[PDB]
């Protein structure tokens, strides 16, 4: 559609790591952002976050081709 | 052929609005997707996007009959 997520996790909340899309190993995206992007052949995993915030839409934390349809 | 576009616009990049195909007035498709679909008697216009991403292939933003040959 015509035009950062920043959703927040608590201690035991799950999220996705995607090693193909991350800027570095501390980056992560929320489950909705993961589900609305394309990671089909990517090396992704469900993680327990220990808290933090979603990197989707932030080119300094996540590769743009890994953004979801709502944060491009 | 056998089986979302998500191409991204910058601020001053053009795209197409199709009022016949859009799910709402904030939806748009890129020029290649417009040219590879059928909008013959549709109420379409070239627009300056102000940024965003192409909705072609996403049934939640665009009517499937409006998808191009590459996103069906
Ligand atoms: Zn998110
Ligand atoms: Zn997102
Ligand atoms: Zn990925
Ligand atoms: Zn497109
Ligand atoms: Zn298309
Ligand atoms: Zn149309």
Swiss-Prot record, chains A, B:
Belongs to the E3 ubiquitin-protein ligase UBR1-like family. Disruption phenotype: Reduced seed germination potential and inhibition of seedling establishment by sucrose. Exhibits abnormal shoot and leaf development. Increased tolerance of seedlings to submergence and starvation. It comes from the Eukaryota. It comes from Arabidopsis thaliana. Ubiquitin protein ligase which is a component of the N-end rule pathway with arginine specificity, and functions with the arginyltransferases ATE1 and ATE2. Recognizes and binds to proteins bearing specific N-terminal residues that are destabilizing according to the N-end rule, leading to their ubiquitination and subsequent degradation. Does not participate in degradation of proteins with N-terminal Phe or Leu. The N-end rule pathway regulates seed after-ripening, seedling sugar sensitivity, seedling lipid breakdown, and abscisic acid (ABA) sensitivity of germination. A zinc finger (UBR-type) spans 4-72. This is E3 ubiquitin-protein ligase PRT6.
